[PDB]
Write a protein that binds this ligand. Structure first.
Ligand code: CLA
Ligand code: CLA
Ligand code: CLA
Ligand code: CLA
Ligand code: CLA
Ligand code: CLA
Ligand code: CLA
Ligand code: CLA
Ligand SMILES: CC1=C(/C=C/C(C)=C/C=C/C(C)=C/C=C/C=C(C)/C=C/C=C(C)/C=C/C2=C(C)CCCC2(C)C)C(C)(C)CCC1
Ligand SMILES: CC1=C(/C=C/C(C)=C/C=C/C(C)=C\C=C\C=C(C)\C=C\C=C(C)\C=C\C2=C(C)CCCC2(C)C)C(C)(C)CCC1
Ligand code: SF4
Ligand code: SF4
Lengths: 81, 75, 30, 156, 733, 225
């Protein structure tokens, strides 16, 4: 909600975005719309720093996890002080 | 580095190098103006960049022409 | 005469009151 | 536009006079038969025959004694711009048309990537002359409609 | 909300200092304010406009007040060619003694500033004659400013704010603006020209006290009613005229002479009265086109629909463009800027050739300071027009209501537009630079004839079509047979042809090979500048690298390092890179105008015509040579009047060089630098007692670009503006 | 490879100074004849670059200051600049060959590389140490007595060739009488006998404006030990 992270239906369940979140935002939930039978999910968008590496590892036509930068909070700005 | 090699060039022409009279009086290349004109930023523009770029700028038509071109070419 | 008063007022006082006025307004919280 | 012919312009015959005098100034300091004296003399003759050709081929000179080019197309002056210009356009297509043939030629291979960083020399030799007749060949492509494509652009 | 800014909650809860910076830049963007509605959007703009008129009137009341309280206006009139116009007085308590002496000039008693805005001549021409006219001139404008401030407040209360349908009335507005705003005002300015101005230039002092007795023409207000208007052009000002008195003063009020006033080197007064009278009619008649309430006149919606070409080459043509324009503010603004951007360049081009104010063609510095001023304004405004084109495609465009019309097609072959712009820029770049290096080299080796001098003959043919006889092409208006010549031999040609062949004015200067090469350099700027802006506009909605760019807005930092890196992808950044090419382009224009004129004014026209074909000629003979007097504004021997311009000159270099710091060094480095600093401050004794309220962070990525460009532009204007004024005013010739 | 290119770079500089320079003329009036060691072909007018550097020659006036380096080593011949150019070129082939040999034919192992005690041990004594001492040699027998002729003022063509001093020991006597006793004072710690050509003067030489070659001769010897 600080930043908005959205995952579409193109996702093929490869678990490459989840493994690449450096602050544990995304996670994997069951589906039935792929051969792998699992689609990603973003239930902890607060801590989302905005580091687009989460979607530099989604290998689809355009993309299946997308990140929109909104307002910035004290943790979405990664302030240590 | 650039200011160092600027500092060296002006200090030596103004205080060290230059011809010497047969009588013994010495006249340096720029007339010993470093000690007064180098303290103002505009001084480094008038008497160093503007006044010591004369030779490069009007170096067209003689053997120093290749420097006149490179001067522009490096800009 | 008149410049010697109006130049400082717009150069020194009017800036100071301006900066101190905004600083409170910017840094408010309600 | 008032540009007098260079063979007439006294200013043109002034520049020719100074540059000769300037060179002859630099010459009366070496030996009358050393290597510098010959190289100086060589450039002196090159200069005089340079000015003569500029006052012969109909170049028009202004008030600067310098040639001016009339690119308006007045065909009294065709060898200044138009004739060299057509000479370029012939060459430029030759480079253009040959390169196009090659890319098409190697297009139908397993990976056209390899045949462009490592150019096929023999294939580029049987294509290098096809640029002699590019105006004829291309103009037929345009009529036949194979010089361009219509809406199939990326991928294939 | 809950704190500054009141108009954006998302920014308010930002704890860092980012809020303060971003609470200032997004103040005026009324769409992105929270809780905005289409009624508020207009009503704020309408109130804001009245705020901008208040500034304009208050600004102009400042000039009149100082020029008439600390200026030379009454004395300057007595001899316009030997009394420096005075702008205002200087009271700076850091001044030492030799500066106080140096800046005392213009026949004042203390330090002053010489006015280069050319107000003194403009107010001379339009009839002002003492100080006292100026004081009431100050008060009146001050009152008009007060009136405007009332209006901006008034139209925000209920029962005084217009509804939506009032603003969206595109027809009734175009009638009034065309007929009332442009129209009557031009008619009334004609009234002032022939009731005050023209009588002033003939020794008659007419004012509000007595302007009822005096007659503009001794038989006035008759000859017009009868139909024999052929009397108001009867007996004009003689050739031997002194601008402020009655010698040779004719009595004609409306004429058609076209030449110059011989003494003051300006356009005749009686022409300018006629011209504002002529175009006072065109707009009035052009004002009754569109239908408002009375059942006659076109409907602009209908005209757009009807123009649909058969054959389909323009698709559905202009169908539906009415709503798209009439509902998108960013569209209307774009058009306004484009039109305003052009005429400002037009104003710059015409003023210096046809001086419209008395004794302004011999104040050389005023000419340069004006022509250079308006081109830079025009350079900025023209960039805005495309910038708000991009915002249109993002926020307000609708891909359904514009189905296949002329607007959607410009998004359909965007590849064809972009590439050819790239071609024309490349072709101009290679050869304009190409021929230039060749010209440079050929002179380095001591052979000047081996240059490539291309005679700019087409522009010389055109100059021959307007009557200039230097090139002797013998065409229309330069040949006696031509019916076009015969059609004007008895109306304006004798004056116009006498001005065009005079070699003192700047009317149609002789051009040579130098002027050919520079013009392409100018032409290169316009295409390349256009290419960036046009590439920005058409790819705003999306492109292959990111086909949903529309979902992020006009300005966003980047899209991350993936897919190969996406730095500088927002349509904002297209505007960003554009400004650099605008400043460079306008650099190449004003450079050209100044040097060509600065050689002319000295009567040394050969110097430009030879040095201006090789680059070292521009660097040696224009930059290096003409800055000799400027840099000596203050040296270890003394100071001069020119010291202030010498100081500003370096001050220009300093801000400009600070610009690089924000463009090159990007954010991530500085952010790590702050964190160490924000640790040191948290551990220093006696200094851990003071705590930041708003956490310190480095500027954002877009902010640095904007900040970095602000320095670059400011330093680039101040640097040139100092050199332009000092070098010219140093010689006053 | 990097070592080989430098040798090839050196070879050109010595070659160019021999075939295309007014070096021998420069040895006559070094005060007022510019050093020139590059001459351009006259194609497109670029022969204007051939400046009047004087000395009956033309060409690009150099500034890398090789000429003062070739005089401080007592070269005084175009022939000697030529032979070193060949010698420099040969080593380039040696180094370049050496590079090939030690990667494709016989490449060293790791244990060879990591033994950094011997590494330092050789470089200090072998390269740095014996490098100076050998050079302090060439200054004593060649650069010193020859340059002492040119500074004394003689045409370069008549200076007896450097192998004459090293053969005819009496010639070194006519300048430096300490060379009569031979190298025995060095072995009897009467080192104050070589005070003619090993000194501690300091300052600069008034004749030529440079250091005193006696000090330089001593300096490398002191460094060598
Ligand atoms: C824009 C308005 C403005 C005005 C009216 C002044 C006025 C003054 N400045 Mg000042 N200054 C300004 C802006 C201004 N400054 C800015 C923007 C800067 C930053 C660049 C400075 C930096 C500056 C310095 C560094 C110094 C001054 C000083 C002075 C004093 C002049 C010297 C003198 O005779 O003092 C006579 C009067 C006194 C010595 C006593 C002070 C009387 C107080 C103000 C009452 C005077 C009070 C000098 C000064 O007086 O400081 C000691 C001084 O050293 N100013
Ligand atoms: C066979 C080679 C070839 C051909 C036929 C074209 C054809 C075209 N290019 Mg082009 N281009 C090429 C190579 C080529 N390109 C290369 C290698 C580059 C990289 C530098 C570019 C960069 C480029 C740009 C940036 C632009 C074009 C544009 C264009 C179009 C207009 C012509 C123009 O402006 O020329 C442009 C000419 C150049 C930029 C000169 C460089 C071309 C080199 C010198 C030719 C290389 C030939 C090849 C190496 C020889 C192969 C021989 C084979 C036997 C091995 C046209 C479709 C323009 C366009 O879109 O207009 C519609 C445009 O903006 N091209
Ligand atoms: C909007 C502009 C404007 C306005 C408000 C007026 C207003 C006036 N004019 Mg006027 N005038 C104008 C434009 C204008 N004029 C122009 C453009 C011309 C040039 C033809 C004239 C020529 C003119 C004459 C010749 C006379 C007036 C006169 C008058 C006055 C009485 C009119 C009945 C009145 C003050 C008459 C008068 O008595 O005023 C002194 C008069 O004799 N005017
Ligand atoms: C009269 C003409 C006019 C009008 C009405 C506007 C009005 C607007 N412009 Mg605009 N613009 C204009 C001329 C104009 N501009 C010109 C001439 C240019 C070219 C330089 C631009 C370039 C431009 C850009 C690049 C952007 C706008 C934006 C905006 C909108 C928000 C401005 C804001 O909040 O920033 C106000 C800014 C400040 C208060 C601080 C600016 C500090 C500068 C350096 C002061 C000097 C606003 C509707 C922005 C927008 O819509 O954002 C989405 C936007 O991105 N315009
Ligand atoms: C010395 C400064 C300099 C130069 C030479 C250029 C040159 C160019 N810029 Mg450029 N630019 C500059 C500064 C400069 N820029 C700066 C400071 C900015 C702001 C960041 C930009 C921003 C910018 C943008 C945004 C764009 C350009 C474009 C272009 C090209 C325009 C086409 C043209 O004329 O090519 C003529 C060719 C040359 C000048 C190359 C000559 C060098 C020789 C011939 C090459 C071979 C030598 C061996 C050209 C390559 C535009 C472009 O791509 O055009 C299609 C474009 O989109 N530039
Ligand atoms: C650093 C390497 C280098 C460079 C840059 C040049 C550069 C040049 N050489 Mg050169 N040259 C070199 C090494 C080099 N040479 C070597 C090692 C030899 C010996 C084989 C030569 C022998 C040589 C000859 C014989 C000639 C050149 C010539 C030229 C020319 C150009 C200035 C020409 C010059 O003639 C005036 C020419 O004729 N070179
Ligand atoms: C475009 C014309 C042109 C051509 C064909 C050449 C060609 C050549 N130059 Mg050259 N040169 C040129 C322009 C040109 N140069 C320019 C503009 C300069 C001034 C910087 C020089 C300065 C220059 C120095 C030297 C050459 C040399 C050479 C030759 C060997 C490299 C080669 C024949 C070398 C020889 O001669 C050499 O020493 N050139
Ligand atoms: C490694 C350097 C080196 C080399 C190869 C030589 C080589 C030689 N020296 Mg020698 N020498 C050197 C350094 C060197 N010297 C130093 C540093 C000194 C100063 C102490 C001397 C002092 C010296 C004397 C005093 C004499 C030689 C002589 C000789 C020659 C006969 C042995 C021989 C060619 C003898 C000679 O004259 O040979 C002709 C001789 O009498 N040398
Ligand atoms: C981006 C965009 C946009 C914008 C655009 C623009 C900004 C444009 C501009 C444009 C321009 C800027 C244009 C210009 C034009 C011009 C013209 C069009 C001209 C013409 C001229 C003429 C016509 C002339 C004529 C003549 C002559 C020749 C001379 C004599 C006289 C006469 C008159 C006859 C918008 C917003 C829409 C939106 C969409 C996108
Ligand atoms: C006459 C003249 C002139 C004029 C000119 C003009 C005006 C032109 C125009 C032109 C144009 C207006 C053109 C257009 C074009 C278009 C297009 C469209 C084209 C195309 C082309 C192509 C397509 C090609 C291709 C190719 C080839 C064939 C070869 C190479 C390769 C390639 C493939 C590239 C002047 C004055 C200068 C001077 C005198 C002469
Ligand atoms: S931007 Fe970073 S934090 Fe946010 S989801 Fe992607 S990887 Fe995770
Ligand atoms: S990276 Fe993309 S495809 Fe893979 S799991 Fe994540 S969203 Fe799905």
């Amino acid at each position: 909600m600080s930043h908005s992270v959205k995952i579409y239906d193109t996702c093929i369940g490869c678990t490459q975005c989840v493994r690449a979140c450096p602050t544990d935002v995304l996670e994997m939930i069951p589906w039935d719309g792929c051969k792998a039978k699992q689609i990603a999910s973003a239930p902890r968008t607060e801590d989302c720093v905005g580091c687009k590496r989460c979607e530099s590892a989604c290998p689809t036509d355009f993309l299946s996890v997308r990140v929109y930068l909104g307002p910035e909070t004290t943790r979405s700005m990664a302030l240590s002080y | 580095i650039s200011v160092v090699i600027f500092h060296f060039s002006w200090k030596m022409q103004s205080d060290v190098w230059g011809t010497i009279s047969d009588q013994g009086v010495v006249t340096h290349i720029t007339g010993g103006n470093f000690a007064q004109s180098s303290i103002t930023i505009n001084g480094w523009l008038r008497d160093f960049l503007w006044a010591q770029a004369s030779q490069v700028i009007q170096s067209y038509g003689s053997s120093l022409s290749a420097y006149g071109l490179f001067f522009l070419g490096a800009h | 005469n008149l410049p010697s008063i109006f130049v400082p007022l717009v150069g020194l006082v009017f800036p100071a009151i301006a900066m101190t006025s905004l600083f409170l307004y910017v840094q408010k919280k309600k | 536009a008032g540009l007098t012919p260079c063979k007439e312009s006294k200013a043109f015959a002034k520049r020719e006079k100074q540059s000769v005098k300037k060179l002859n100034s630099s010459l009366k300091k070496y030996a009358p038969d050393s290597a510098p004296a010959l190289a100086i003399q060589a450039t002196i003759d090159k200069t005089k025959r340079r000015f003569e050709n500029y006052g012969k081929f109909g170049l028009l000179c202004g008030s600067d004694g310098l040639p001016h080019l009339i690119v308006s197309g007045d065909q009294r002056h065709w060898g200044e711009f138009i004739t060299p210009g057509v000479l370029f356009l012939y060459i430029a297509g030759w480079i253009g048309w040959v390169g196009r043939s090659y890319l098409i030629a190697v297009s139908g291979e397993k990976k056209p990537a390899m045949r462009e960083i490592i150019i096929d020399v023999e294939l580029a030799a049987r294509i290098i002359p096809r640029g002699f007749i590019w105006p004829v060949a291309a103009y037929r492509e345009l009529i036949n409609g194979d010089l361009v494509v219509d809406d199939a652009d990326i991928g294939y | 909300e809950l704190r500054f800014p009141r108009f954006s909650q998302g920014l308010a809860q930002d704890p860092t200092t980012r809020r303060i910076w971003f609470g200032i830049a997004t103040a005026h963007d009324f769409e992105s304010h929270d809780d905005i509605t289409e009624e508020r959007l207009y009503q704020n703009i309408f109130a804001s406009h009245f705020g901008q008129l208040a500034i304009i009137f208050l600004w102009t009341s400042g000039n009149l007040f100082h020029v008439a309280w600390q200026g030379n206006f009454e004395s300057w009139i007595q001899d316009p060619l030997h009394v420096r116009p005075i702008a205002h007085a200087i009271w700076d308590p850091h001044f030492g003694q030799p500066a106080v002496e140096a800046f005392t000039r213009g026949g004042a008693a203390g330090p002053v500033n010489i006015a280069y805005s050319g107000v003194y001549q403009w107010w001379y021409t339009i009839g002002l004659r003492t100080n006292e006219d100026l004081y009431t001139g100050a008060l009146f404008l001050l009152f008009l400013s007060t009136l405007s401030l009332i209006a901006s407040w008034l139209h925000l209360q209920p029962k005084w704010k217009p509804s939506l349908s009032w603003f969206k009335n595109a027809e009734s507005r175009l009638n009034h603006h065309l007929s009332g705003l442009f129209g009557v005002s031009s008619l009334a300015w004609t009234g002032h020209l022939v009731h005050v101005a023209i009588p002033a230039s003939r020794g008659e002092y007419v004012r509000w006290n007595n302007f009822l007795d005096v007659l503009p023409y001794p038989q006035g207000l008759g000859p017009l009613l009868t139909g024999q208007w052929n009397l108001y052009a009867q007996n004009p000002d003689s050739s031997n005229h002194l601008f402020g008195t009655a010698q040779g003063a004719g009595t004609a009020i409306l004429t058609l002479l076209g030449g110059f006033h011989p003494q003051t080197q300006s356009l005749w007064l009686t022409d300018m009265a006629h011209h504002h009278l002529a175009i006072a009619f065109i707009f009035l008649i052009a004002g009754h086109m569109y239908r408002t309430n009375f059942g006659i006149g076109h409907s602009i919606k209908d005209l757009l629909e009807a123009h649909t070409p058969p054959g389909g080459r323009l698709g559905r043509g202009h169908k539906g463009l009415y709503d798209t324009i009439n509902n998108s503010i960013h569209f209307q603004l774009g058009l306004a800027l484009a039109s305003l951007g052009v005429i400002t360049s037009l104003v710059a081009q015409h003023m210096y050739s046809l001086p419209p104010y008395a004794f302004i063609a011999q104040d050389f510095t005023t000419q340069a300071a004006l022509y250079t001023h308006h081109q830079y304004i025009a350079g900025f405004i023209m960039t805005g027009a495309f910038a708000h084109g991009a915002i249109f495609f993002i926020r307000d465009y609708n891909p359904e209501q514009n189905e296949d019309n002329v607007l959607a097609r410009m998004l359909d072959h965007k590849e064809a537009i972009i590439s050819h712009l790239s071609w024309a820029s490349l072709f101009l770049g290679f050869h304009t630079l190409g021929l230039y290096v060749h010209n440079d080299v050929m002179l380095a080796f001591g052979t000047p004839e081996k240059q490539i001098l291309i005679e700019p003959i087409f522009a010389q043919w055109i100059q021959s079509a307007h009557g200039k006889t230097t090139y002797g092409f013998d065409i229309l208006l330069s040949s006696t047979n031509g019916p076009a010549f015969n059609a004007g031999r008895s109306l304006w040609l004798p004056g116009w042809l006498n001005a065009v062949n005079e070699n003192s004015n700047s009317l149609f200067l002789t051009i040579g090979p130098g002027d050919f090469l520079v013009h392409h350099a100018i032409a290169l700027g316009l295409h390349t500048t256009t290419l960036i802006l046009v590439k920005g506009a058409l790819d705003a909605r999306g492109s292959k690298l990111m086909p949903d760019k529309k979902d992020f807005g006009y300005s966003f930092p980047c899209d991350g390092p993936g897919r190969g890196g996406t730095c500088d992808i927002s349509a904002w950044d297209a505007f960003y890179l554009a400004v650099f090419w605008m400043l460079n382009t306008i650099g190449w224009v004003t450079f050209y105008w100044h040097w060509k004129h600065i050689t002319l004014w000295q009567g040394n026209v050969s110097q430009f015509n030879e040095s201006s074909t090789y680059l070292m000629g521009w660097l040696r003979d224009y930059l290096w040579l003409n800055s000799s007097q400027l840099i000596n504004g203050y040296n270890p021997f003394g100071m001069n009047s020119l010291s202030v311009w010498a100081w500003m000159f370096l001050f220009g270099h300093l801000v400009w060089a600070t610009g690089f710091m924000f463009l090159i060094s990007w954010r991530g480095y500085w952010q790590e630098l702050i964190e160490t600093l924000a640790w040191a401050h948290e551990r220093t004794p006696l200094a851990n007692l003071i705590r930041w309220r708003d956490k310190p962070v480095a500027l954002s990525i877009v902010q640095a670009r904007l900040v970095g460009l602000a320095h670059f532009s400011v330093g680039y204007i101040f640097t040139y503006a100092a050199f332009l004024i000092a070098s010219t005013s140093g010689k006053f010739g | 490879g990097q070592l080989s290119i430098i040798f090839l770079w050196l070879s050109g500089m010595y070659f160019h100074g021999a075939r295309f320079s007014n070096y021998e003329a420069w040895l006559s009036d070094p005060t007022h004849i510019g050093p020139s060691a590059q001459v351009v072909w006259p194609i497109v007018g670029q022969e204007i670059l051939n400046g009047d550097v004087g000395g009956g020659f033309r060409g690009i006036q150099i500034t890398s200051g090789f000429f003062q380096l070739w005089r401080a080593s007592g070269i005084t011949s175009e022939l000697q600049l030529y032979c070193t150019a060949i010698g420099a070129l040969v080593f380039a082939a040696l180094m370049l060959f050496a590079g090939w040999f030690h990667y494709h034919k016989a490449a060293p192992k790791l244990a060879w590389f990591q033994d950094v005690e011997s590494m330092l041990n050789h470089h200090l004594a072998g390269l740095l140490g014996l490098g100076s001492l050998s050079w302090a040699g060439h200054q004593i027998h060649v650069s010193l007595p020859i340059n002492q002729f040119l500074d004394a003022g003689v045409d370069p063509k008549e200076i007896p060739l450097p192998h004459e001093f090293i053969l005819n020991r009496d010639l070194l006597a006519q300048l430096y009488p300490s060379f009569a006793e031979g190298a025995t004072p060095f072995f009897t710690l009467n080192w104050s006998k070589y005070a003619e050509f090993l000194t501690f003067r300091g300052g600069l030489d008034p004749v030529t404006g440079g250091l005193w070659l006696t000090d330089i001769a001593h300096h490398h010897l002191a460094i060598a030990i």
